[PDB]
Amino acid sequence: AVISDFIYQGASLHNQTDRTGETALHLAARYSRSDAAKRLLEASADANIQDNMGRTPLHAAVSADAQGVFQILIRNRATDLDARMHDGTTPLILAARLAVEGMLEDLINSHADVNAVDDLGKSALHWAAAVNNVDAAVVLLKNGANKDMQNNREETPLFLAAREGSYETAKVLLDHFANRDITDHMDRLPRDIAQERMHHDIVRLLDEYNLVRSP
């Protein structure tokens, strides 16, 4: 064949497009071409080469919700499950943000680091809180996620849930007894940022919900 799995006759498996910096394996992920991805890996393609934004074929599979290629990639021992994009984003954080539930759990079960963080000190749980991804929050919390971890602005996931108006996820954090007293760098409590951004429902939750025999 003149071309096989995006690779032109006799070219390197690691060659990258000028436009996106993507390799054949990145493209197999985006097109959900399970067979191509399998053949490329058997030919020893590097599953951790980064495109122009630092994404590996695994970030690409998550972004394209390609379950087939995704499975193939996480089953491949050499795949860096915690690969970071140029802003520190990992496949897990990415899965939490896009709300691709099946992948988040599969990543965690494959031992992805639940407490890894992007360049802003944000963990997958911080993000699940920010986008109000309840299911991701529950699974991360059940799997060792640090509920009170502070990012670089000293914001906890709860702080972020308060900031963004993620009512349901702030509730999950409280059901897990997250510390609602930890403030950000401006000394604001999740309650203070919730009031400032007009999420009165969350302010109420913080003042009454699941308190110490005082709720």
Swiss-Prot record:
Residues 40-48, 107-115 are annotated as: HIF1AN-binding. ANK repeats lie at residues 20-49, 53-83, 87-116, 120-149, 153-182, 188-215. The modification (3S)-3-hydroxyasparagine is found at residues 48, 115. It comes from the Eukaryota. It is found in: Nucleus. This is Notch 1 intracellular domain. The lineage of its organism: Eukaryota, Metazoa, Chordata, Craniata, Vertebrata. The gene is NOTCH1. The chain holds residues 1908 to 2122 of 2555 of the full protein.
